[PDB]
Design a protein around this ligand. Structure first.
Ligand SMILES: Nc1nc2c(ncn2[C@@H]2O[C@H](CO)[C@@H](O)[C@H]2OP(=O)(O)O)c(=O)[nH]1
Ligand SMILES: Nc1nc2c(ncn2[C@@H]2O[C@H](CO)[C@@H](O)[C@H]2OP(=O)(O)O)c(=O)[nH]1
Lengths: 96, 96
């Protein structure tokens, strides 16, 4: 299940960076940006393979790509944030 | 993010000295000159480890290395100046 919505202004600023890149179709910092998200744990609504894609949300100070990601779906503004490597997701509200 | 581009002539003259030393591969005044800059805070574009290196920009009168540095990237003419110990950066334009 999606854990409610979260205002974009409340997320780490890098979340805004990633959305901006998704809007311009990159260029993305990591070669893994834009790969299909399989939704293998079925936390998000079931859809055909390829419906969701994932993008890194950089964690300043981390030595790796870390655990923050934005997952997009095909619907308009259908963007989910996860800060715990897909354990939980929130739908991003870009209006607050 | 990079703050903007600044002409080399608009930076302290010591920035010029540092760039001249980098062009001749030293010798450098400090042993830390030329070590890898990790980009740990993710201020500059994401790159592999070792893409960036740091060099001191001498602060006249200082007893320590101070807060001025030139960070080079592996690309042609990619050099950034920081006067606040990596809080902010400007790309240096050596053509003006
Ligand atoms: N847990 C999980 N990882 C997924 C899923 N789809 C793609 N992945 C990616 O597959 C990897 C293998 O576990 C994960 O680290 C994640 O890589 P990312 O680090 O790029 O997010 C999914 O549905 N669940
Ligand atoms: N803030 C910061 N310091 C770095 C980085 N890479 C190397 N350093 C150097 O590592 C030290 C310990 O974190 C910093 O004080 C700085 O020492 P310098 O002034 O010698 O560059 C980096 O990516 N960020």
């Amino acid at each position: 299940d999606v854990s409610g919505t979260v205002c974009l202004s409340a997320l780490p600023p890098e979340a805004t960076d990633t959305l901006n890149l998704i809007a311009s179709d990159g260029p993305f910092p990591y070669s893994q940006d834009g790969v299909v998200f399989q939704n293998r744990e079925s936390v998000l609504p079931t859809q055909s393979y390829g419906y969701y894609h994932e993008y890194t949300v950089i964690t300043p100070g981390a030595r790796t790509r870390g655990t923050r990601r934005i997952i997009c779906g095909e619907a308009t503004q259908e963007d989910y944030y996860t800060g715990d490597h897909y354990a939980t997701f929130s739908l991003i509200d870009q209006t607050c």
